[PDB]
Amino acid sequence: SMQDPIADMLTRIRNGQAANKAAVTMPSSKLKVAIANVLKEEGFIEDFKVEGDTKPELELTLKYFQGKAVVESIQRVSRPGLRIYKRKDELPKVMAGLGIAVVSTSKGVMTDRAARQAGLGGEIICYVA
Amino acid sequence: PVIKVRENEPFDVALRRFKRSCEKAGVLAEVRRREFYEKPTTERKRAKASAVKRHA
Amino acid sequence: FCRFTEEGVQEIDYKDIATLKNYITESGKIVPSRITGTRAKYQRQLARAIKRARYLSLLPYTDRH
RNA sequence: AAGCUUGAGUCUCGUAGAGGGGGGUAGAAUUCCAGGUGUAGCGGUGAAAUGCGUAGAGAUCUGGAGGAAUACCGGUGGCGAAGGCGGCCCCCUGGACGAAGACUGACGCUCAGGUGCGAAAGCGUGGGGAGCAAACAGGAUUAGAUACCCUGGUAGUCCACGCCGUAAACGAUGUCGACUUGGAGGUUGUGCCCUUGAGGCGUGGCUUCCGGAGCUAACGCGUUAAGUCGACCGCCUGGGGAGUACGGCCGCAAGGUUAAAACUCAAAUGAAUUGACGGGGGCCCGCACAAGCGGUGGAGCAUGUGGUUUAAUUCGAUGCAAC
Ligand SMILES: [Mg+2]
Ligand SMILES: [Mg+2]
Ligand SMILES: [Mg+2]
Ligand SMILES: [Mg+2]
Ligand SMILES: [Mg+2]
Ligand SMILES: [Mg+2]
Ligand SMILES: [Mg+2]
Ligand SMILES: [Mg+2]
Ligand SMILES: [Mg+2]
Ligand SMILES: [Mg+2]
Ligand SMILES: [Mg+2]
């Protein structure tokens, strides 16, 4: 079954990074779009664009700065098998700050750092470096 | 391989023709195969080996 | 080289003796697709036709009987 | 609460297929029965013997009777969830796959227990019994030969409805779903473009090999992953003891299944590497064999050893490479 879309997206991204793909196309969602936007803001990717009315397709443009992939490690901590929820002060700092965590924050999906700044916890989706 | 002798044709030539026919048939080989019973598994293995050999 | 493909036929019939005899040897033994250069389904069809002929005693099982 | 199509389905045309189950039937060949011709052996092996044959076998021609399996096609061919399934033809029927399209709208995935299928052998009644063939017998072989080899030969192998429920049931890779540079192909379709010709454009499903990234302990696997993720299960936690005991559950029985403990050992393995070895393969070579010439070994004599003996038989040398 098509159980986790976000995880699938992440996997696709990883594959792209590995195989040096310029653009990665994948089925789209609102939460997915938000995640992509967050990633863009963080500076990992060039540009994202969603196209499709009945079948929405998210296209993601990847960066390869100085002959090497920017998104080095990208892995879910929260999972469909096991969901991880974290408190405000319990929020992780991925690779001593030099690297980030995608958190499902109740005041909009964002970075762990951003959540900390806000004063709000939630579900820690993915670990991005 | 039923073989008949033509007029204006030597015996040796006829023999040779017969031999060729036999070769074409593969009767001797068949007999060899059937001389002793082969387990299906063994036959399959042999076939696989032959296939492998074919690849060069 | 497959003749059947060149022809463009739906079914190989046991009626045509002249085509079927070209694809078996004198003793009464079927010639492979690897030698003739035939498509596999077509080969199968041909074999079936040959079998039918044998059943009807149109082309022999063995040339000595 | 309300909706969507891409997931998952069903409908239109097809596609091939050892997909099953049931019913018919074809050929060859073996065996046997009967007869005809025929005569000295046949059969077997490394060589033989047991066997068969002066009653006429084998050989061989004709007539049959049967039982089983389907040569050739046949191919890392195909189909199936697997186990498996190959003569042909019909009936019943499952599924797969595809092409254009139409519609349902998450109906999805896995699965504890549970249920069904499940090679072989075996077991059960009833059949059937040609070959083959456990067991069994004889012959050999052999130091012995309960074997390998030969001649024979019962159960079984074959069907009928049941039981069994194990296989190295093995892709030794759970099942499903997603993604990631490739090639050579093969297989199975299909749709366009003037098919201007077998063909061309590409472009979807299915299987095989090599191999990039990657991965791993390497070997290797490698868009059918053992790669990058997700789900879900199942199972492992040193070897042995032991997948055994005991108990349960199942079994007509054989046993199967679940599944220990004590004690015991410091290993148990896995891959690969250098070796050595092989009654493995390839290469070459030596008086190694062959072909030859003479010996020794038999005799006496010389000598040296050992063994026994002697008061002492100095001591060392011990396959070649001590005598
Ligand atoms: Mg609707
Ligand atoms: Mg059985
Ligand atoms: Mg029985
Ligand atoms: Mg025997
Ligand atoms: Mg004996
Ligand atoms: Mg088992
Ligand atoms: Mg098997
Ligand atoms: Mg296993
Ligand atoms: Mg490979
Ligand atoms: Mg047991
Ligand atoms: Mg002497």
XYZ file of C-alpha atoms (C1' of nucleotides) and ligand atoms in Angstrom:
584
model
C 0.000 0.000 0.000
C 0.855 3.688 -0.500
C 1.138 4.204 3.264
C 3.461 7.180 3.835
C 3.564 9.913 1.178
C 6.004 12.197 2.995
C 8.471 9.349 3.519
C 8.158 8.399 -0.147
C 8.862 12.010 -1.147
C 11.924 12.061 1.094
C 13.159 8.810 -0.454
C 12.684 10.267 -3.939
C 14.650 13.370 -2.934
C 17.453 11.167 -1.589
C 17.515 9.184 -4.829
C 17.715 12.407 -6.841
C 20.603 13.595 -4.701
C 22.394 10.284 -5.262
C 21.814 10.065 -9.054
C 22.385 13.840 -9.603
C 18.872 14.565 -10.949
C 18.018 18.198 -11.760
C 14.249 17.831 -11.180
C 12.249 15.237 -9.205
C 8.508 14.767 -9.895
C 6.133 13.203 -7.328
C 2.405 13.070 -6.293
C 1.477 16.190 -4.295
C -0.288 17.114 -1.027
C -0.884 20.368 0.953
C 1.263 19.242 3.876
C 3.829 18.017 1.321
C 3.780 21.445 -0.348
C 4.281 23.126 3.025
C 7.241 20.845 3.762
C 8.751 21.697 0.371
C 8.308 25.413 1.077
C 10.022 24.999 4.452
C 12.913 23.177 2.773
C 13.224 25.985 0.208
C 13.272 28.566 3.002
C 16.036 26.629 4.745
C 18.107 26.765 1.515
C 18.462 23.080 0.554
C 16.613 23.320 -2.793
C 16.323 25.726 -5.763
C 12.554 25.867 -6.415
C 9.377 23.799 -5.989
C 6.227 23.822 -8.154
C 2.923 21.920 -7.961
C 1.048 21.193 -11.216
C -2.058 19.038 -11.731
C -5.784 19.406 -11.043
C -7.020 15.782 -10.796
C -3.532 14.308 -10.295
C -1.317 16.954 -8.570
C 2.427 16.591 -9.229
C 5.080 18.298 -7.098
C 8.292 19.092 -8.990
C 11.436 19.767 -6.938
C 14.647 21.377 -8.248
C 17.774 20.181 -6.393
C 21.144 21.853 -5.684
C 24.596 20.276 -6.099
C 26.985 22.886 -4.694
C 30.695 22.438 -5.576
C 30.165 19.021 -7.227
C 28.426 17.462 -4.201
C 24.825 16.998 -3.002
C 23.524 19.553 -0.467
C 20.944 17.266 1.205
C 23.417 14.724 2.608
C 21.134 12.854 5.052
C 17.314 12.955 5.067
C 15.412 10.502 7.325
C 12.022 10.293 9.096
C 11.959 9.902 12.890
C 8.157 10.044 13.129
C 6.808 7.071 11.177
C 3.456 5.353 10.391
C 4.702 2.360 12.422
C 5.944 4.574 15.274
C 5.034 8.253 15.737
C 7.416 10.466 17.753
C 5.930 13.475 19.551
C 8.238 15.967 21.285
C 7.774 18.737 23.852
C 8.995 22.358 23.424
C 12.197 21.893 25.472
C 12.398 18.226 24.385
C 12.891 19.301 20.721
C 16.174 17.994 19.195
C 19.065 19.982 17.703
C 20.112 18.039 14.590
C 23.914 17.922 14.061
C 24.571 20.653 16.698
C 22.353 23.141 14.800
C 24.267 22.604 11.538
C 21.369 20.565 10.164
C 17.628 20.677 10.879
C 14.513 18.707 11.857
C 11.106 18.968 10.167
C 8.463 19.365 12.892
C 4.673 19.232 12.633
C 4.076 22.367 14.701
C 0.494 23.346 15.570
C 1.049 26.921 14.345
C 2.139 25.779 10.854
C 4.604 23.028 9.835
C 8.219 24.241 10.200
C 11.806 23.842 11.469
C 12.605 22.646 15.018
C 14.515 25.866 15.705
C 11.522 27.921 14.592
C 9.241 25.876 16.856
C 11.610 26.458 19.779
C 11.601 30.193 19.056
C 7.792 30.191 18.993
C 7.309 28.145 22.186
C 5.452 25.149 20.738
C 6.059 21.390 20.330
C 4.522 18.533 18.328
C 5.335 15.636 15.993
C 8.945 15.527 14.720
C 8.505 14.372 11.094
C 11.995 14.163 9.550
C 15.711 14.796 10.154
C 17.394 16.851 7.398
C 21.125 17.547 6.933
C 16.711 -43.443 -41.774
C 15.592 -45.732 -44.632
C 18.254 -45.405 -47.343
C 18.054 -46.685 -50.945
C 20.951 -47.200 -53.393
C 20.785 -45.209 -56.657
C 22.131 -46.387 -60.023
C 25.508 -44.843 -61.025
C 26.497 -44.494 -57.342
C 29.264 -46.305 -55.341
C 28.694 -48.278 -52.111
C 31.076 -46.109 -50.081
C 29.206 -42.948 -51.089
C 25.906 -44.588 -50.091
C 27.397 -45.554 -46.722
C 28.582 -41.980 -46.197
C 25.110 -40.657 -47.046
C 23.563 -43.104 -44.550
C 26.007 -41.921 -41.879
C 25.077 -38.295 -42.596
C 21.390 -39.149 -42.318
C 22.020 -40.860 -38.979
C 23.905 -37.799 -37.738
C 21.016 -35.564 -38.807
C 18.568 -37.803 -36.958
C 20.600 -37.981 -33.719
C 19.439 -41.558 -33.097
C 22.616 -42.722 -31.350
C 22.514 -39.726 -29.010
C 18.868 -40.456 -28.205
C 19.739 -44.079 -27.447
C 22.553 -42.919 -25.149
C 20.136 -40.592 -23.354
C 17.635 -43.435 -22.943
C 20.262 -46.133 -22.168
C 19.816 -45.392 -18.454
C 16.889 -43.554 -16.839
C 17.482 -39.900 -16.071
C 15.842 -38.187 -13.104
C 13.978 -35.027 -14.290
C 15.982 -32.902 -11.845
C 19.269 -34.164 -13.244
C 18.100 -33.471 -16.808
C 17.114 -29.940 -15.812
C 20.521 -29.387 -14.215
C 22.223 -30.609 -17.390
C 20.116 -28.252 -19.482
C 21.051 -25.355 -17.211
C 24.734 -26.262 -17.528
C 24.417 -26.367 -21.312
C 22.756 -22.945 -21.300
C 25.583 -21.570 -19.145
C 28.143 -23.018 -21.560
C 26.333 -21.395 -24.486
C 27.072 -17.984 -22.898
C 30.666 -17.005 -23.746
C 14.163 -16.246 -41.373
C 10.475 -16.830 -40.596
C 8.276 -17.450 -43.633
C 5.021 -17.325 -41.655
C 5.666 -13.775 -40.468
C 6.500 -12.727 -44.037
C 3.247 -14.300 -45.249
C 1.026 -12.710 -42.557
C -1.328 -15.602 -41.718
C -3.650 -16.116 -38.718
C -3.475 -19.926 -38.433
C -1.171 -22.604 -39.869
C -3.460 -25.373 -41.147
C -2.785 -29.128 -41.403
C -4.427 -29.097 -44.880
C -1.312 -27.713 -46.632
C 1.003 -30.750 -46.846
C 3.681 -28.947 -48.926
C 4.490 -26.377 -46.205
C 4.483 -28.919 -43.322
C 6.828 -31.429 -45.049
C 9.488 -28.689 -45.409
C 9.610 -28.415 -41.593
C 10.166 -32.129 -40.809
C 13.005 -34.499 -41.800
C 12.782 -37.719 -43.892
C 12.581 -40.096 -40.881
C 9.534 -38.320 -39.384
C 11.053 -35.902 -36.873
C 10.322 -32.185 -36.312
C 12.927 -29.496 -37.142
C 13.586 -26.876 -34.349
C 12.730 -23.152 -34.458
C 16.421 -22.295 -33.848
C 17.460 -23.908 -37.169
C 14.487 -22.683 -39.270
C 14.348 -19.189 -37.691
C 10.671 -19.257 -36.659
C 8.572 -17.337 -34.090
C 7.685 -19.418 -31.021
C 3.893 -19.355 -31.140
C 4.048 -20.055 -34.872
C 6.428 -22.963 -34.219
C 4.008 -24.353 -31.636
C 1.146 -24.056 -34.125
C 3.209 -25.874 -36.750
C 3.990 -28.652 -34.272
C 0.301 -28.996 -33.445
C -0.536 -29.209 -37.152
C 2.116 -31.908 -37.613
C 0.649 -33.858 -34.690
C -2.828 -33.580 -36.218
C -1.485 -34.852 -39.541
C 0.168 -37.790 -37.774
C -3.124 -38.597 -36.031
C -4.913 -38.496 -39.393
C -1.927 -40.413 -40.935
C -1.290 -37.598 -43.444
C 2.415 -37.293 -42.549
C 4.012 -40.295 -40.754
C 5.160 -40.734 -37.142
C 7.982 -42.947 -38.464
C 9.236 -43.524 -42.031
C 9.909 -47.265 -41.506
C 6.312 -47.814 -40.281
C -19.780 15.516 7.736
C -19.002 15.841 2.757
C -15.919 14.708 -1.984
C -11.749 13.262 -5.761
C -8.747 9.341 -9.102
C -3.738 7.856 -9.791
C -4.241 3.213 -5.391
C -7.803 -1.017 -5.636
C -11.735 -2.820 -8.635
C -15.590 -4.270 -12.502
C -17.309 -3.773 -17.566
C -15.751 -3.810 -24.316
C -12.229 -6.420 -27.664
C -8.743 -9.481 -27.546
C -3.712 -12.439 -26.087
C -1.001 -16.769 -25.603
C -0.496 -20.279 -22.331
C 2.499 -28.347 -19.804
C -3.234 -23.162 -15.500
C -6.390 -26.909 -13.426
C -10.398 -30.962 -13.233
C -13.241 -34.603 -16.093
C -14.047 -37.449 -20.403
C -12.373 -39.547 -24.742
C -8.631 -41.184 -28.031
C -2.848 -41.536 -31.300
C 1.747 -43.298 -32.024
C 6.316 -45.746 -30.829
C 8.618 -48.898 -27.567
C 8.966 -52.602 -23.754
C 6.656 -56.985 -21.677
C 3.777 -61.089 -22.384
C 0.481 -64.556 -24.993
C -0.094 -67.437 -29.977
C 1.870 -68.966 -34.425
C 5.522 -69.002 -38.772
C 10.823 -68.976 -40.397
C 15.259 -70.236 -38.229
C 20.096 -72.964 -35.136
C 23.893 -72.461 -31.337
C 24.468 -69.980 -28.462
C 21.966 -65.411 -26.106
C 22.341 -62.010 -22.241
C 25.793 -59.308 -19.331
C 30.932 -56.715 -17.689
C 36.414 -53.652 -16.633
C 36.679 -59.032 -17.013
C 33.539 -62.719 -15.583
C 29.746 -65.631 -13.377
C 24.320 -66.182 -11.795
C 20.630 -66.125 -15.657
C 18.286 -67.604 -20.046
C 18.917 -71.444 -24.437
C 18.993 -77.817 -28.071
C 12.222 -78.352 -24.607
C 14.570 -74.192 -30.454
C 16.144 -69.030 -26.605
C 18.271 -64.762 -28.435
C 17.265 -63.876 -33.352
C 13.870 -62.481 -35.897
C 8.284 -61.880 -39.435
C 2.971 -61.846 -38.490
C -1.129 -61.726 -35.287
C -2.672 -59.970 -31.050
C -3.237 -58.649 -25.312
C -2.297 -55.200 -22.336
C -0.156 -51.494 -18.588
C 2.117 -47.154 -18.178
C 4.592 -42.865 -19.941
C 4.343 -39.256 -23.982
C 10.433 -39.336 -28.149
C 10.894 -35.517 -32.092
C 8.530 -29.992 -31.085
C 11.380 -28.125 -26.605
C 14.318 -23.210 -26.132
C 17.835 -19.782 -18.530
C 10.179 -21.669 -23.684
C 5.485 -20.761 -21.094
C 1.633 -20.973 -17.044
C 0.564 -21.290 -12.132
C -0.066 -18.464 -4.971
C 3.125 -22.023 -4.392
C 3.510 -27.774 -4.673
C 3.717 -28.407 -9.915
C 2.261 -29.053 -14.889
C 4.509 -31.327 -21.684
C 0.916 -36.795 -27.202
C -3.791 -35.120 -29.101
C -8.936 -33.704 -29.002
C -13.619 -32.279 -26.664
C -16.531 -30.567 -22.146
C -16.451 -27.749 -17.480
C -13.644 -23.995 -15.534
C -9.841 -20.714 -12.861
C -6.585 -17.077 -13.439
C -3.029 -13.801 -15.789
C -1.780 -10.012 -19.274
C -2.786 -6.378 -22.420
C -5.336 -2.480 -25.631
C -8.399 1.501 -26.331
C -12.033 3.422 -23.597
C -16.562 3.372 -19.514
C -17.808 3.320 -14.474
C -17.361 2.303 -8.754
C -15.016 5.803 -5.465
C -10.088 3.788 -0.708
C -13.456 -0.742 -1.649
C -6.241 -0.569 0.110
C -1.791 -3.762 2.698
C -0.414 -7.505 6.022
C -1.956 -11.163 8.946
C -1.664 -13.561 15.262
C -4.919 -17.263 15.792
C -8.181 -19.691 11.660
C -8.910 -21.863 6.777
C -7.505 -24.035 2.097
C -3.639 -25.879 -1.358
C 0.664 -28.521 -0.656
C 6.533 -32.839 -4.821
C 7.986 -37.346 -2.984
C 7.671 -41.346 -0.234
C 4.162 -43.590 3.031
C -0.802 -45.006 4.943
C -6.065 -46.510 4.053
C -10.178 -49.694 1.308
C -11.076 -50.765 -3.771
C -9.005 -51.301 -8.439
C -4.787 -51.815 -12.117
C -0.245 -53.947 -12.821
C 3.995 -53.183 -18.987
C 8.243 -51.405 -17.514
C 10.972 -49.746 -13.623
C 12.209 -50.867 -8.854
C 13.088 -50.420 -2.537
C 12.967 -54.845 0.170
C 14.336 -59.653 -1.165
C 17.445 -63.940 -3.875
C 21.473 -65.538 -6.556
C 26.003 -64.216 -8.954
C 30.123 -61.524 -8.823
C 33.452 -57.969 -6.489
C 35.700 -58.060 -2.246
C 40.219 -58.950 3.560
C 34.924 -58.689 4.488
C 30.598 -56.308 0.707
C 24.242 -56.474 4.467
C 26.981 -52.042 -0.930
C 28.627 -49.664 -5.723
C 28.270 -53.861 -10.730
C 25.199 -57.927 -13.276
C 20.828 -61.389 -13.592
C 16.476 -61.618 -11.580
C 12.578 -59.924 -8.513
C 7.701 -58.157 -4.025
C 5.857 -53.470 -1.993
C 5.580 -49.341 -4.432
C 5.400 -46.501 -8.759
C -0.881 -46.012 -12.198
C -6.170 -44.721 -11.231
C -10.558 -44.170 -7.678
C -12.214 -41.378 -3.092
C -9.695 -40.404 1.637
C -5.521 -39.628 5.369
C -0.521 -37.950 5.869
C 1.284 -32.697 5.780
C 6.763 -33.242 5.579
C 11.442 -31.796 1.023
C 17.958 -28.382 -0.138
C 8.859 -26.925 -0.514
C 15.679 -23.412 -2.433
C 15.604 -17.101 -5.895
C 18.784 -21.022 0.741
C 16.184 -13.760 -0.516
C 8.450 -13.155 3.795
C 4.252 -10.327 1.575
C 2.770 -5.823 -0.484
C 3.629 -0.731 -2.023
C 7.047 3.328 -3.626
C 11.642 5.330 -5.809
C 17.176 4.968 -8.457
C 22.807 5.713 -14.065
C 22.280 0.977 -17.936
C 23.152 -2.587 -21.675
C 22.724 -7.159 -24.346
C 19.042 -9.683 -25.408
C 15.004 -13.121 -25.355
C 9.559 -13.656 -24.508
C 4.661 -11.879 -24.907
C 1.459 -8.480 -26.853
C -0.205 -3.812 -28.725
C -0.838 1.630 -31.158
C 0.722 5.257 -34.710
C 3.628 7.158 -38.908
C 3.004 6.807 -46.421
C 3.948 -1.149 -43.724
C 6.056 2.779 -50.118
C 8.736 -4.597 -48.256
C 10.384 -8.975 -43.880
C 9.941 -4.023 -41.593
C 10.035 1.818 -39.106
C 8.703 5.070 -34.950
C 8.872 4.567 -30.524
C 6.433 2.543 -26.516
C 3.745 -0.580 -22.682
C 3.352 -5.297 -19.820
C 6.872 -10.408 -18.811
C 10.978 -13.154 -17.917
C 17.421 -14.218 -18.520
C 22.385 -12.880 -18.370
C 26.518 -9.037 -17.723
C 27.090 -5.001 -14.930
C 27.098 1.193 -13.159
C 25.424 3.855 -8.431
C 24.889 1.715 -4.327
C 25.418 -2.096 -0.933
C 27.567 -5.959 1.866
C 32.061 -9.658 5.818
C 33.224 -10.328 0.994
C 31.277 -13.460 -2.533
C 28.273 -11.299 -4.874
C 22.945 -8.851 -5.540
C 22.026 -5.618 -8.557
C 14.747 -1.135 -12.019
C 12.436 -8.987 -10.811
C 18.054 -5.678 -5.249
C 20.724 -8.315 -1.168
C 20.029 -0.379 -3.323
C 17.555 3.940 -1.503
C 12.359 4.129 2.040
C 7.507 2.583 4.045
C 4.074 -0.917 5.980
C 3.265 -5.205 7.973
C 4.282 -9.756 9.790
C 7.328 -14.203 10.689
C 11.753 -15.822 13.073
C 16.937 -15.737 15.333
C 20.184 -14.570 20.075
C 27.219 -19.632 20.601
C 27.673 -24.931 19.271
C 26.186 -29.507 21.087
C 22.609 -31.591 23.891
C 18.218 -31.049 20.194
C 14.334 -29.349 16.473
C 15.418 -34.014 20.596
C 12.905 -35.110 25.590
C 8.223 -34.564 28.337
C 3.516 -32.794 27.844
C -0.249 -31.021 24.759
C -2.715 -30.640 19.801
C -3.027 -33.423 15.183
C -2.297 -38.405 12.969
C -5.302 -45.144 11.390
C 0.015 -45.653 11.862
C 4.454 -43.746 10.406
C 5.058 -39.554 12.717
C 4.094 -34.152 12.300
C 3.625 -29.889 15.001
C 4.675 -26.740 19.112
C 9.283 -26.996 22.256
C 12.716 -27.417 26.741
C 16.057 -28.315 30.756
C 20.306 -30.333 33.108
C 24.995 -31.264 31.706
C 28.891 -29.986 28.266
C 32.360 -27.319 25.077
C 35.421 -22.522 23.925
C 34.627 -22.261 20.222
C 30.456 -22.566 16.129
C 30.487 -21.054 12.012
C 30.529 -17.417 6.888
C 33.041 -15.416 3.211
C 37.308 -14.880 1.111
C 43.328 -15.550 0.949
C 48.243 -18.078 0.779
C 49.276 -22.973 0.698
C 49.331 -27.901 0.372
C 46.450 -31.951 -1.391
C 42.734 -34.406 -5.007
C 41.868 -41.996 -7.042
C 39.802 -33.162 -10.634
C 41.163 -30.483 -15.484
C 44.723 -28.714 -18.578
C 49.538 -28.250 -19.960
C 55.161 -29.955 -20.086
C 59.453 -32.840 -18.120
C 62.906 -37.075 -16.204
C 66.012 -43.998 -18.378
C 59.186 -42.485 -15.080
C 56.833 -46.094 -18.289
C 57.071 -48.280 -22.892
C 60.944 -50.445 -26.190
C 65.253 -52.659 -25.131
C 70.502 -54.296 -22.243
C 72.272 -56.559 -17.973
C 71.559 -57.527 -12.946
C 69.932 -58.435 -7.714
C 66.778 -61.397 -5.500
C 68.205 -68.496 -5.937
C 74.366 -70.393 -4.739
C 78.989 -69.875 -2.760
C 82.331 -66.110 -1.385
C 83.489 -60.361 0.535
C 81.358 -56.930 3.378
C 77.723 -53.960 6.363
C 73.621 -53.975 9.267
C 70.079 -55.825 12.183
C 68.472 -59.905 15.435
C 70.014 -63.297 18.903
C 74.357 -64.142 21.724
C 78.876 -62.815 24.503
C 82.299 -60.940 30.378
C 82.542 -57.261 26.042
C 80.309 -57.989 20.866
C 82.953 -48.994 21.065
C 79.580 -45.788 19.305
C 76.922 -43.259 15.572
C 74.088 -43.659 10.793
C 67.512 -45.924 10.106
C 62.674 -45.066 3.861
C 64.799 -42.660 -0.697
C 68.558 -39.028 1.613
C 71.151 -45.871 6.961
C 73.022 -50.631 5.621
Mg -18.547 9.313 -6.476
Mg 2.371 -39.975 -3.787
Mg -1.505 -47.627 -2.038
Mg 19.373 -53.956 -9.125
Mg 23.793 -59.918 -2.988
Mg 10.137 -27.537 7.217
Mg 11.351 -27.482 -5.811
Mg 13.952 -21.839 4.322
Mg 25.154 -9.945 -11.960
Mg 10.026 -34.218 17.090
Mg 71.796 -64.420 -3.137
